[PDB]
Design a protein around this ligand. Structure first.
Ligand SMILES: O=c1ccn([C@@H]2O[C@H](COP(=O)(O)OP(=O)(O)O[C@H]3O[C@H](CO)[C@@H](O)[C@H](O)[C@H]3O)[C@@H](O)[C@H]2O)c(=O)[nH]1
Length: 482
């Protein structure tokens, strides 16, 4: 029943021993793409979400049996090509001598010492992140490394890049590894199911999984969420934050109205269905509305809670897949070579599972559960004193910020790549806890002990010479120039 292109994909995947759940999942996306689907979600088809419960209003914590049944997973399979990264982002330094992986392991240790003695922790890796993550734990945290292969690591799948005009699997004789790509972090459900780990977790008595981004060190277990999901019988819960100006890369919550038409004299009652819209899913000529933080003010944190037996049941009842909406990413098979064949890279976002369950919902959480690092501008804020380290080893906004991170605007010509950002803070990281907005234009180098307050702009109009800010300089509500 499949097309020739789709069959070619199946054959390639089978020959490469790709797990069948992945093949089934991918093919379904392939069929959608062949019928015109791109993943685009226009604003005319959605409407904002105006009312949600709040974590700040919750007080009751879950019982010990529920806490014991909760697995913690951290995403760690992405390639931060936007920050000029070649390995796992979690190996980058966050504070003095501590990486993302350092605080993550310290959070797990803390939870095991004070909350759940046998807390199960997992990492979803790619082959482009697996060995470096394992060797890091090998040296710094041997208790995690000893059970790394047995219970920690979940290996994400690889799917073929398909030619844009025929949807056949793309070939690249120069480097056939470039014929494959990660299918996004929405692959977590497919990888858990196809590897049999989802069934084994349910067999072992686990009932909840808390997933979060590897770059968000503010996301740990909150026992009030588990009690909330138990009481309200919620099978999937997405943590959303009130959107700030800094929330530009990610996705926002949205709703549609599905009319359960009337019965037994009852009228047609509207029921709100929730969905996620990534930035890639917004029509590119309509990005103004995706960026309106007032129109769509609920930003997905990717702190997700899933009831594992219901996820398992749902997948089994759908041929062994979770039919997440496909995102059609347009690239070239060698993303560095504009002359290489153009391809589609079919991906899904794990937050899109909010549309897969009848009892799915979202809850508004404070900013201290969301400290994202998508760019080097985010990393400057996280490295600065605007973020502090909690006792349970979370990275949270300083209380003085009132939930608003400093708005950091770095010249993309000089600081988009990690090597360029490293030159900017070579002599020290400026104080930004009292800085509302910092904009760096042109070639600039921070000095030692810089203190920024208010709205600060550093503009070097002649980038033939870098502008080194003097040591101890204090910039308050000003624009500094050579
Ligand atoms: O194939 C992939 C792609 C990504 N990741 C991991 O997924 C996490 C998030 O990926 P990132 O590329 O950093 O973010 P986005 O996918 O753009 O956005 C996600 O995170 C945002 C919050 O930061 C939310 O607003 C979005 O809805 C959610 O999809 C990171 O730990 C990545 O390493 C994987 O494990 N495998």
């Amino acid at each position: 029943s499949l097309s020739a292109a789709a069959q070619a994909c199946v054959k390639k995947m089978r020959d490469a021993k790709v797990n069948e759940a992945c093949i089934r999942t991918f093919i379904a996306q392939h069929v959608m793409v062949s019928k015109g689907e791109t993943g685009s979600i226009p604003d005319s088809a959605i409407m904002p979400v105006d009312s949600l419960d709040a974590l700040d209003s919750l007080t009751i914590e879950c019982d010990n049996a529920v806490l014991q049944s909760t697995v913690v997973l951290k995403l760690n399979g992405g390639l931060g090509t936007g920050m000029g990264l070649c390995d796992a982002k979690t190996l980058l330094e966050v504070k003095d001598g501590k990486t993302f992986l350092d605080f993550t392991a310290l959070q797990v240790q803390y939870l095991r010492q004070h909350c759940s003695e046998h807390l199960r922790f997992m990492l979803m890796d790619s082959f482009n992140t697996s060995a470096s993550t394992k060797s890091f734990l090998k040296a710094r945290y041997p208790w995690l490394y000893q059970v790394f292969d047995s219970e920690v690591e979940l290996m994400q799948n690889q799917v073929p890049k398909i030619l844009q005009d025929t949807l056949e699997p793309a070939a690249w004789a120069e480097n056939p590894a470039y014929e494959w790509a990660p299918p996004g972090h929405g692959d977590i459900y497919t990888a858990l199911y196809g590897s049999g780990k989802l069934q084994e977790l349910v067999e072992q008595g686990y009932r909840y999984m808390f997933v979060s981004n590897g770059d968000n060190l503010g996301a740990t277990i909150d026992k009030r969420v588990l009690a909330y999901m138990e009481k309200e019988k919620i099978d999937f819960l997405m943590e959303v934050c009130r959107r700030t100006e800094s929330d530009k890369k990610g996705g926002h919550l949205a709703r549609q109205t599905v009319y359960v038409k009337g019965k037994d004299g009852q009228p047609d009652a509207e029921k709100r269905v929730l969905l996620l819209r990534e930035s890639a899913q917004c029509p590119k000529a309509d990005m103004e509305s995706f960026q309106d933080i007032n129109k769509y003010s609920f930003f997905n944190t990717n702190n997700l809670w899933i009831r594992l037996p219901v996820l398992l049941e749902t997948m089994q009842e759908h041929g062994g897949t979770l039919p997440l909406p496909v995102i059609r990413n347009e690239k070239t098979v060698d993303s560095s070579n504009s002359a290489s064949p153009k391809v589609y890279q079919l991906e899904t976002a794990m937050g899109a599972a909010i549309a897969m369950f009848e009892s799915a919902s979202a809850i508004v959480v404070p900013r201290w559960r969301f400290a994202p690092v998508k760019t080097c501008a985010d990393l400057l804020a996280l490295r600065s004193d605007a973020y502090v380290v909690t006792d349970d080893f979370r990275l949270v906004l300083d209380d003085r910020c009132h939930g608003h991170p400093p708005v950091v605007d770095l010249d993309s010509a000089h600081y988009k790549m990690m090597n360029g950002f490293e030159k900017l803070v070579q002599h020290g990281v400026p104080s930004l806890v009292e800085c509302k907005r910092v904009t760096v234009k042109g070639l600039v180098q921070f000095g030692a002990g810089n203190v920024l307050t208010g709205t600060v702009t550093i503009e070097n109009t002649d980038s033939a010479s870098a502008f080194v800010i003097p040591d101890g300089a204090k910039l308050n509500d000003t624009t500094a120039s050579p």
